[PDB]
Amino acid sequence: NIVGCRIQHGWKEGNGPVTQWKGTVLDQVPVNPSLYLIKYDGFDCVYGLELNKDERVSALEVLPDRVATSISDAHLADTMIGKAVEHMFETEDGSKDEWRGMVLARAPVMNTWFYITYEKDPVLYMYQLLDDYKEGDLRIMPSLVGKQVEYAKKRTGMVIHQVEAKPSVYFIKFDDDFHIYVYDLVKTSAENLYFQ
Ligand SMILES: COc1cc2c(NC3CCN(C(C)C)CC3)nc(NCCN(C)C)nc2cc1OCCCN1Cc2ccccc2C1
Ligand SMILES: [Cl-]
Ligand code: NA
Ligand code: NA
């Protein structure tokens, strides 16, 4: 399949202009093989697209350049998984800000990258956390998969993955959006989610 490949495609919403995108295919979701998780070059979120049916996608092409294959410190990486973190980053004005979040897993395909999410935006992100850590920007603090989900806004989706390191945490793909939403099912954020 196209997992592990780099791809490029056009994107058009409605009568808007076509924009061009390059990225890396990370995963073909077991519970919905039409759904691919993609990391676009320079964009930090993980996106899910049903490439075989999404008419917003045009001119889909496999790129001839290979994904970097190739971690510098697998043991350090291992220890980050499941940890609460404070993640500092540089802002438009040159000052730094920080978001607190949780390291979820090593990313597939892109070896040096990690899945992470944040209280301020609880969707799936990917960063090279060992690079950010070495530069002093990362402080480490001391089955439902395949089921349908709804919440009242009726927003509908599917549970696509369970986080091994924190089994009450799941990834959800909603039908109306291309982000991957992350929820800890014991928390308030998840209290309007119901499953079938
Ligand atoms: C924008 O957030 C981050 C950018 C990062 C980021 N940018 C770079 C921007 C400038 N460079 C140059 C080459 C042109 C290219 C890449 N580089 C890195 N780590 C490599 C550098 N290191 C090791 C010194 N890490 C980053 C971590 C970020 O945020 C973590 C918390 C989650 N965010 C999501 C978010 C969304 C909207 C508002 C705010 C946030 C906060
Ligand atoms: Cl930064
Ligand atoms: Na620094
Ligand atoms: Na959408």
Curated annotation (Swiss-Prot):
Subunit structure: Homodimer; may form higher-order oligomers. Interacts with TCF7L2/TCF4; the interaction is direct. Interacts with HABP4 and SERBP1. Interacts with SPINDOC; SPINDOC stabilizes SPIN1 and enhances its association with bivalent H3K4me3K9me3 mark. Interacts with SPOCD1; promoting recruitment of PIWIL4 and SPOCD1 to transposons.
Consequence recorded when altering residue 58 to A: Impaired phosphorylation
Chain segments carrying region Tudor-like domain 3: 144-189
One Gene Ontology term, aspect cellular component: nucleoplasm
Residues carrying the site annotation Histone H3K4me3 and H3R8me2a binding: 121, 128, 132
Effect listed in the UniProt record for changing residue 90 to A: Impaired binding to histone H3K4me3 and H3R8me2a
GO molecular function: histone H3K4me3 reader activity; histone reader activity; methylated histone binding
Stated role: Chromatin reader that specifically recognizes and binds histone H3 both trimethylated at 'Lys-4' and 'Lys-9' (H3K4me3K9me3) and is involved in piRNA-mediated retrotransposon silencing during spermatogenesis.
Record annotation: effect of changing residue 118 to A: Impaired binding to histone H3K4me3 and H3R8me2a and impaired ability to activate the Wnt signaling pathway. Impaired ability to activate expression of pre-rRNA
Region annotated Tudor-like domain 1, chain positions: 2-65
Protein family membership: Belongs to the SPIN/STSY family.
Cellular localisation: Nucleus; Nucleus, Nucleolus
Residues passing through the membrane, by range: none
Record keywords: Acetylation, Cell cycle, Chromatin regulator, Developmental protein, Isopeptide bond, Meiosis, Nucleus, Phosphoprotein, Repeat, Ubl conjugation, Wnt signaling pathway
Disulfide linkage: none
Shown stretch of the complete protein: 52 to 262 of 262
Phosphoserine modifications at: 58, 72
Name used for this protein in its record: Spindlin-1
Post-translational modification: Phosphorylated during oocyte meiotic maturation.
Region (Histone H3K4me3 and H3R8me2a binding): 42-47, 90, 177-179
Tissue expression per record: Highly expressed in ovarian cancer tissues.
Domain notes: The 3 tudor-like domains (also named Spin/Ssty repeats) specifically recognize and bind methylated histones. H3K4me3 and H3R8me2a are recognized by tudor-like domains 2 and 1, respectively.
Annotated segments matching region Tudor-like domain 2: 80-141
GO BP term (any one): rRNA transcription
Chief location of this protein within or outside the cell: nucleus
